[PDB]
Design a protein around this ligand. Structure first.
Ligand SMILES: CCCC(=O)Nc1nnn(CC)n1
Length: 152
């Protein structure tokens, strides 16, 4: 049948919100009150892939935009990018591997591992207003844990 999707927001474990920062850019910063309208709303699709109780393959598209988070090699490194797709063809159940994240539930938080690049995670910096990126370890100064908020 159709792929199933939910609208949601993400915040990192320091409660930083994610916002659009100009073309194909996402930034993490502390947000509260009126300014929270600026946060990015995701359409999280539940896609084809290897699955276990606490490890669920998803795609992360921007709500009602033909833009998806994806993992590709750039100047020879696993990187996180926003990628344009054909809006007639997405979302779909069989998303290409660069778009797939393993959503992992650990100690009441979520981590998003690249399906393409094992042990690379959606990450934020501790500093304010820095890019969201792919970080090649879930252990150090960089933040790899999130909570999800479900949206109407
Ligand atoms: C998925 C988000 C990718 C992104 O934000 N990349 C990126 N690279 N340089 N910047 C501006 C400082 N931002």
């Amino acid at each position: 049948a159709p792929v199933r999707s939910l609208n949601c927001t993400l915040r990192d474990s320091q409660q930083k919100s994610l916002v659009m920062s100009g073309p194909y850019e996402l930034k993490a910063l502390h947000l509260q009150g009126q300014d929270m309208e600026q946060q990015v709303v995701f359409s999280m699709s539940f896609v084809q892939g290897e699955e276990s109780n606490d490890k669920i393959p998803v795609a992360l598209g921007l709500k009602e935009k033909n833009l998806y988070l994806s993992c590709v090699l750039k100047d020879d490194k696993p990187t996180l990018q926003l990628e344009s797709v054909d809006p007639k063809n997405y979302p779909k159940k069989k998303m290409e591997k660069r778009f797939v994240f393993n959503k992992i539930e650990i100690n009441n938080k979520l981590e998003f591992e690249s399906a393409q690049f094992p042990n690379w995670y959606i990450s934020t910096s501790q500093a304010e207003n820095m890019p969201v990126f792919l970080g090649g370890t879930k252990g150090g100064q960089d933040i790899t844990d999130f909570t999800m908020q479900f949206v109407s």
